[PDB]
Amino acid sequence: AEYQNIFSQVQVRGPADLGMTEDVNLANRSGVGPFSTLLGWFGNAQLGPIYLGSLGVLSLFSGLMWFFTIGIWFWYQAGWNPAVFLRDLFFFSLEPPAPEYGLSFAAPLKEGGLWLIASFFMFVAVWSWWGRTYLRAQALGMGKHTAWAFLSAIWLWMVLGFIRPILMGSWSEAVPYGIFSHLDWTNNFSLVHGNLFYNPFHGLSIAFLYGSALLFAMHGATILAVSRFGGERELEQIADRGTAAERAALFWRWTMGFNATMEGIHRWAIWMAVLVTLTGGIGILLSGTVVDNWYVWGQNHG
Amino acid sequence: DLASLAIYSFWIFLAGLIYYLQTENMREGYPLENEDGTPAANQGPFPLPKPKTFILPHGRGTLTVPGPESEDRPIALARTAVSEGFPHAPTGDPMKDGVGPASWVARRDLPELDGHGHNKIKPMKAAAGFHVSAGKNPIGLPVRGCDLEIAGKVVDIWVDIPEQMARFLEVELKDGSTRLLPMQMVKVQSNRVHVNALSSDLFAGIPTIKSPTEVTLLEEDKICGYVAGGLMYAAPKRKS
Amino acid sequence: ALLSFERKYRVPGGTLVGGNLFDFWVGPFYVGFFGVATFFFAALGIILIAWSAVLQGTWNPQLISVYPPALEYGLGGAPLAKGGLWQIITICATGAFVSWALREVEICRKLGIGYHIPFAFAFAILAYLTLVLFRPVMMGAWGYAFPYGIWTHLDWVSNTGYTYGNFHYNPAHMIAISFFFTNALALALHGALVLSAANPEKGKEMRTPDHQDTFFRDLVGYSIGTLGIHRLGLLLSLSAVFFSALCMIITGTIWFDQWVDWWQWWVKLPWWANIPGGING
Numbered sequence: 001a002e003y004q005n006i007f008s009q010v011q012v013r014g015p016a017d018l019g020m021t022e023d024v025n026l027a028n029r030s031g032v033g034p035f036s037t038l039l040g041w042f043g044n045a046q047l048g049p050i051y052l053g054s055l056g057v058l059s060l061f062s063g064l065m066w067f068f069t070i071g072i073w074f075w076y077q078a079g080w081n082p083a084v085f086l087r088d089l090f091f092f093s094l095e096p097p098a099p100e101y102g103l104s105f106a107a108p109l110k111e112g113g114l115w116l117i118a119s120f121f122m123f124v125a126v127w128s129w130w131g132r133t134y135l136r137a138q139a140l141g142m143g144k145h146t147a148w149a150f151l152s153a154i155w156l157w158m159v160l161g162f163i164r165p166i167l168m169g170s171w172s173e174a175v176p177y178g179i180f181s182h183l184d185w186t187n188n189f190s191l192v193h194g195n196l197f198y199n200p201f202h203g204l205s206i207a208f209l210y211g212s213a214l215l216f217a218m219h220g221a222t223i224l225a226v227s228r229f230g231g232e233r234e235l236e237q238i239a240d241r242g243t244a245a246e247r248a249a250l251f252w253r254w255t256m257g258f259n260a261t262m263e264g265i266h267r268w269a270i271w272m273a274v275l276v277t278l279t280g281g282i283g284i285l286l287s288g289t290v291v292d293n294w295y296v297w298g299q300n301h302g
Numbered sequence: 303d304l305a306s307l308a309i310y311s312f313w314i315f316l317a318g319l320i321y322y323l324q325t326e327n328m329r330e331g332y333p334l335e336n337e338d339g340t341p342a343a344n345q346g347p348f349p350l351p352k353p354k355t356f357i358l359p360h361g362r363g364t365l366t367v368p369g370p371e372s373e374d375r376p377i378a379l380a381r382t383a384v385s386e387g388f389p390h391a392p393t394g395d396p397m398k399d400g401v402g403p404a405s406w407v408a409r410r411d412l413p414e415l416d417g418h419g420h421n422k423i424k425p426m427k428a429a430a431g432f433h434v435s436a437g438k439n440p441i442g443l444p445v446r447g448c449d450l451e452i453a454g455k456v457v458d459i460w461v462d463i464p465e466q467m468a469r470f471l472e473v474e475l476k477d478g479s480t481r482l483l484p485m486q487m488v489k490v491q492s493n494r495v496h497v498n499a500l501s502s503d504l505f506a507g508i509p510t511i512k513s514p515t516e517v518t519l520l521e522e523d524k525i526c527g528y529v530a531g532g533l534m535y536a537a538p539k540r541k542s
Numbered sequence: 543a544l545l546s547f548e549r550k551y552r553v554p555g556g557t558l559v560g561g562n563l564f565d566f567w568v569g570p571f572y573v574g575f576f577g578v579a580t581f582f583f584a585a586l587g588i589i590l591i592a593w594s595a596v597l598q599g600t601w602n603p604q605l606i607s608v609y610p611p612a613l614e615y616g617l618g619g620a621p622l623a624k625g626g627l628w629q630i631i632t633i634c635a636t637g638a639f640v641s642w643a644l645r646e647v648e649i650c651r652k653l654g655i656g657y658h659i660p661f662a663f664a665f666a667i668l669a670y671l672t673l674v675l676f677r678p679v680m681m682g683a684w685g686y687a688f689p690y691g692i693w694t695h696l697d698w699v700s701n702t703g704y705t706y707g708n709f710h711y712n713p714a715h716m717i718a719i720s721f722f723f724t725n726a727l728a729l730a731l732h733g734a735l736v737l738s739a740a741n742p743e744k745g746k747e748m749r750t751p752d753h754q755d756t757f758f759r760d761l762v763g764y765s766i767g768t769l770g771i772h773r774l775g776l777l778l779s780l781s782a783v784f785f786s787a788l789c790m791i792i793t794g795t796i797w798f799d800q801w802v803d804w805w806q807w808w809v810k811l812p813w814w815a816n817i818p819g820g821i822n823g
């Protein structure tokens with residue numbers, strides 16, 4: 001058989017690449033890390049360096065604080081027993097304050113306060129990391145696609161644990177930190193709103209999720225199919241169409257009747273994935289604020 | 303109600319978005335043509351997008367798309383029917399002529415430069431500090447064609463420096479000249495390198511590069527093109 | 543009719559079946575023998591679907607629904623109005639799909655590219671076959687399959703799910719979802735990365751792939767690279783769908799109880815099974 005190019009058949013290494021410099025504060029970048037030959041069989045073998053900076057540290061510190069604040073709670077639940085801790089790891093749960101406290105920041109710690117702390121930590125963690133995606137791009141003079149794409153994701157998360165709990169009048173409507181518990185909450189959230197399968201945003205959202213898989217399958221297999229003509233070198237192909245771009249476009253034109261360009265295909269991409277949580281966010285936001293039951297809504301349309 | 307509002311709104315958003323998406327992918331190979339090259343009559347509902355201009359690094363100019371399209375090379379094909387929609391048969395050697403699955407595009411005759419302005423791809427001999435870090439080092443292994451005959455020997459690996467990747471094997475032929483072989487079209491074995499697309503007798507036809515320490519976008523295309531085309535056109539020489 | 547660079551690619555050959563017979567195009571579309579096959583299967587299937595619609599007495603697409611045979615019929619044939627029609631329609635779909643894949647193969651050859659696309663598609667086809675063929679057989683009636691209707695199919699999903707409790711607890715379902723989510727994440731990034739390089743800040747020069755690699759090491763300390771992310775995508779996708787099949791093929795066959803309950807295995811490991819406190823003690 002023919003070679004498929006899913007895994008490299010020969011690895012080549014050179015001096016650790018410290019990357020482009022542009023307006024980046026080189027003082028903040030780390031030192032190069034080791035090289036995984038493991039990783040090397042799939043993609044790049046070089047680890048690091050990474051850029052630290054102020055926002056990275058804040059993000060990274062709040063990030064751990066969040067995770068740990070949950071962790072101690074799990075331990076307190078486990079009776080500080082490492083055996084129970086392992087047995088019951090997916091059953092533990094840090095739940096929001098009771099509906100009694102409403103949008104109150106005065107819930108006792110064992111009764112919801114600890115959840116607020118953890119969330120506060122996550123909030124700062126996530127937003128700082130957002131600002132990080134933006135700045136990292138600015139400092140290289142790049143488009144801010146990544147930060148805007150990221151914002152979509154942030155939308156759904158914002159809505160789940162912040163905007164919806166606030167518009168409903170209580171934190172109790174938010175998602176608990178826990179493996180099995182956040183699954184249950186999800187399953188239950190649908191039951192209460194009259195089956196999310198009638199939420200047309202939910203349905204839209206699924207279409208874009210399914211689609212993301214469909215597309216990234218299409219794009220990936222295509223680029224591999226024409227990497228025998230240097231397909232993966234998409235920037236230069238955009239700047240100077242190679243046969244790669246041509247065979248790519250034509251295979252698709254001949255199959256289904258229309259086609260992308262190399263820059264084009266990546267717009268299809270960023271929008272198909274970004275629409276998942278965009279539509280998603282909206283479906284959930286209206287759920288319980290404007291629409292109490294999607295089946296009833298489904299019967300009338302109003 | 304609000305919900306009804308939102309969803310109706312979205313289906314409208316989505317429609318102009320597809321429209322956008324679609325017109326952006328119309329930046330190349332449009333407008334459409336008839337088999338004779340004259341502009342086709344029905345170009346679909348979508349207008350050509352307004353042109354956009356790319357500023358290429360290292361003072362290599364600009365690119366504006368959509369723009370005037372031209373093959374900028376002869377096509378050795380002849381019609382096989384009297385109506386539209388049928389194949390065009392090569393009028394010579396499709397391989398030698400570069401039509402079919404052997405087609406190449408008239409890319410610029412300059413090499414791809416890395417972020418610093420140095421040639422992206424290099425023979426490893428001239429790439430200070432590069433080495434095969436894993437897998438079988440091909441260098442020195444004979445090269446076998448689909449006809450199971452030896453055609454040459456690997457005498458180097460042309461690496462991609464910024465992505466630290468093996469892109470082509472350089473091969474030494476019986477007359478002492480060398481050719482590049484795309485990495486993606488050869489199977490490196492324990493005692494040989496096997497090339498399924500080309501039979502031993504076609505390796506010489508592989509287009510040559512003008513300078514021994516560089517490849518240009520044009521030469522990459524002519525090579526990849528040629529080797530790929532072997533799959534369909536060397537077929538009579540391939541046995542297994 | 544042709545893209546400005548299409549003609550030199552439109553050469554004879556690459557057909558799997560039937561030589562030059564169907565080796566031709568119709569507008570942008572490539573026909574090929576399988577071009578014909580899929581058309582025929584697609585024609586037939588849509589017909590039968592309309593025919594089901596008159597027996598149902600509705601032309602409204604939100605209502606139309608073609609159901610499999612009821613469990614009483616097992617894996618035997620059933621009367622048209624009573625499940626036959628779905629069975630043929632299913633045969634026809636399969637015919638369509640497989641044929642569409644083989645045409646992709648034929649186009650692949652004419653263009654001289656790899657077969658990765660036909661390849662990946664076969665995973666979609668295999669997921670569909672899991673739900674209407676492999677699972678029902680193994681379970682023992684066509685009746686376990688999902689019906690062909692816009693909402694009725696969402697209903698099968700919901701009912702089939704809730705049969706084993708909260709389906710969230712199906713462990714291969716957990717894995718399959720992690721890919722779906724991960725893949726979307728990665729498609730989000732990849733797209734965004736290339737665009738931001740090709741469309742930098744106003745008046746600046748096209749960034750480079752070195753810029754792509756740097757932007758990510760700066761961000762998370764690693765970059766899988768331009769060849770990598772494409773290998774990654776193909777993989778996450780194929781995996782999502784692979785695990786999706788798996789979670790269903792096991793459901794109802796080797797596990798018919800509540801999925802949540804299957805986790806009792808973990809919690810009941812003798813080394814901590816009786817230790818008091820926590821959630822389960």
Ligand code: BCL
Nearest residue numbers: 202203204206207208210211214670688692693695696699
């Ligand atoms: C695989 C998982 C489950 C399942 C769970 C769900 C859930 C959950 C949802 C859907 C949704 C949808 N499902 Mg389903 N669905 C299954 C199997 C199928 C089959 C199949 C033959 O196997 C198909 C064709 C569909 C098709 C569809 C669409 C009607 C809709 C949007 C999907 C999408 O965007 O995908 C991505 C693909 C693309 C963007 C490519 C283009 C796809 C177009 C839209 C295909 C439409 C075909 C349809 C109109 C019938 C044509 C058949 C005849 C030729 C006329 N499902 C199985 C049983 N399906 C969502 C919905 O909103 O519908 C109620 C939804 O919420």
Ligand code: BCL
Nearest residue numbers: 153157186187189190196197202205206209280281283284
């Ligand atoms: C019983 C369950 C209910 C149901 C209830 C819900 C609920 C409730 C919700 C969904 C949601 C979704 N559902 Mg539903 N859903 C059902 C059945 C289905 C079926 C099916 C039957 O086949 C499918 C395919 C889906 C599919 C989906 C997705 C399309 C959608 C979420 C998209 C997403 O990627 O968010 C994943 C992405 C995020 C959550 C974004 C978060 C990003 C943040 C910033 C990440 C930060 C990381 C953190 C800080 C930790 C750092 C990481 C560590 C360092 C490692 N549902 C049934 C009807 N579904 C969501 C939705 O949008 O609905 C409209 C939602 O809220």
Ligand code: BCL
Nearest residue numbers: 666667669670699700702703708709710718719786787790
């Ligand atoms: C109440 C519902 C239950 C539940 C019950 C089920 C059940 C039951 C099933 C799933 C399945 C799935 N679930 Mg679940 N699931 C729930 C909640 C979720 C949520 C969630 C957030 O809560 C998520 C993210 C998911 C996600 C998923 C996926 C892993 C998977 C669906 C995709 C798939 O299988 O592709 C597979 C892809 C295909 C079948 C598509 C095939 C397309 C074919 C080959 C071609 C189409 C051609 C078409 C006809 C073209 C038309 C012509 C026009 C020209 C376009 N589930 C809850 C707990 N879940 C399904 C699954 O795993 O299936 C195996 C499934 O059966």
Ligand SMILES: CC[C@H]1c2cc3[nH]c4c(c3C)C(=O)[C@H](C(=O)OC)c4c3nc(cc4[nH]c(cc(n2)[C@@H]1C)c(C(C)=O)c4C)[C@@H](C)[C@@H]3CCC(=O)OC/C=C(\C)CCC[C@@H](C)CCC[C@H](C)CCCC(C)C
Nearest residue numbers: 059060063125126129149150152153273274723726727730
């Ligand atoms: C558009 C929709 C999709 C999307 C897009 C998206 N997400 C994004 C982005 C984009 C475009 C980014 O740019 C941003 C990113 O930087 O990615 C590289 C991000 C991102 N999406 C993430 C996760 C994520 N996205 C998700 C979803 C999605 N993201 C959507 C499907 C999901 C889910 C639930 O499906 C998750 C879990 C992060 C990887 C990253 C945002 C990172 C962040 O905000 O960090 C804040 C805080 C920290 C620094 C916390 C660190 C704490 C950890 C140390 C604790 C855990 C330790 C653990 C035991 C370690 C071991 C792991 C082992 C595997 C080795």
Ligand SMILES: CC[C@H]1c2cc3[nH]c4c(c3C)C(=O)[C@H](C(=O)OC)c4c3nc(cc4[nH]c(cc(n2)[C@@H]1C)c(C(C)=O)c4C)[C@@H](C)[C@@H]3CCC(=O)OC/C=C(\C)CCC[C@H](C)CCC[C@H](C)CCCC(C)C
Nearest residue numbers: 210213214217587635638642662663665666690691692783
């Ligand atoms: C494996 C990963 C994902 C994937 C990949 C994938 N899909 C693919 C490909 C690939 C690589 C293609 O090459 C091929 C394509 O050409 O894309 C443009 C395809 C494709 N995936 C499609 C759809 C699709 N893929 C899906 C899923 C996925 N595809 C995965 C998530 C889904 C869903 C539900 O998630 C859908 C709806 C098509 C757009 C296209 C294949 C087109 C095709 O087969 O044409 C032949 C058939 C016809 C013209 C119609 C036949 C009519 C039937 C005879 C009767 C109708 C019966 C049907 C069962 C009724 C169902 C009714 C519903 C309401 C339930």
Ligand SMILES: COC(C)(C)C(=O)C/C=C(\C)CC/C=C(\C)CC/C=C(\C)CCCC/C(C)=C/CC[C@H](C)CC/C=C(\C)CCC=C(C)C
Nearest residue numbers: 068070071119120123157158160161162175177178179182
């Ligand atoms: C090994 O043991 C130690 C102690 C060392 C450990 O560290 C182990 C730690 C683990 C056991 C930790 C385990 C952690 C998990 C199981 C976490 C799981 C988390 C999820 C499943 C989360 C799902 C969903 C979360 C959502 C949607 C959160 C949303 C958050 C927000 C939008 C934030 C909103 C902000 C709030 C309410 C406060 C705002 C206040 C202001 C003043 C602005």
Ligand SMILES: CCCCCCCCCCCC[N+](C)(C)[O-]
Nearest residue numbers: 200201203204207211271272320
């Ligand atoms: C990126 C463009 C592709 C978008 C796909 C649009 C078709 C999805 C159809 C979903 C059917 C939905 N709905 C609203 C009735 O639930």
Ligand SMILES: CCCCCCCCCCCC[N+](C)(C)[O-]
Nearest residue numbers: 257258259320324345346347348
């Ligand atoms: C949900 C995905 C739907 C894809 C949107 C359909 C776009 C069709 C574009 C046809 C272009 C016609 N043309 C110019 C190539 O002849």
Ligand SMILES: [Fe+3]
Nearest residue numbers: 219223234736
């Ligand atoms: Fe790409």
